[PDB]
């Protein structure tokens, strides 16, 4: 079984009806994941959750979005994706802005 360190890649926020922070993750064993918002652990609710694409056969890479539904200026801030497995840790952060702040 091919073992290798967890890795992540984060892309800038895109609007696709809902908002999406796109990402990729990889690793063997399959990594564990967590999101942070301004350094705080982000709990997934029906308005912010992780949504994956179905993975293609014969590949360990996983792609998806942090999907935000109906966000506002309060959701503007620093999003971090954390991944880990036994062979390494990875981390990536971007700034996202969804509405102008009053």
């Amino acid at each position: 079984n091919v073992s290798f360190p967890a890795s992540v890649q984060l892309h800038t926020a895109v609007e696709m009806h809902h908002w999406c922070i796109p990402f990729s993750v990889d690793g063997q064993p399959a990594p564990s994941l967590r999101w942070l918002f301004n350094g705080s652990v982000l709990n997934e609710t029906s308005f912010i959750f992780t949504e994956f694409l179905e993975p293609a056969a014969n590949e360990t890479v996983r792609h998806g979005c942090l999907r935000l539904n109906q966000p506002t200026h309060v959701n503007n801030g620093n999003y971090t994706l954390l991944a880990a497995n036994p062979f390494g840790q990875a981390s990536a952060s971007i700034m996202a802005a969804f509405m102008d702040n009053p």
Partner: peptide, 14 residues
Amino acid sequence: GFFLYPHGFYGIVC
């Protein structure tokens, strides 16, 4: 963790 995936997603867990 995952709102959509109580048992993880193809190995990936929250």
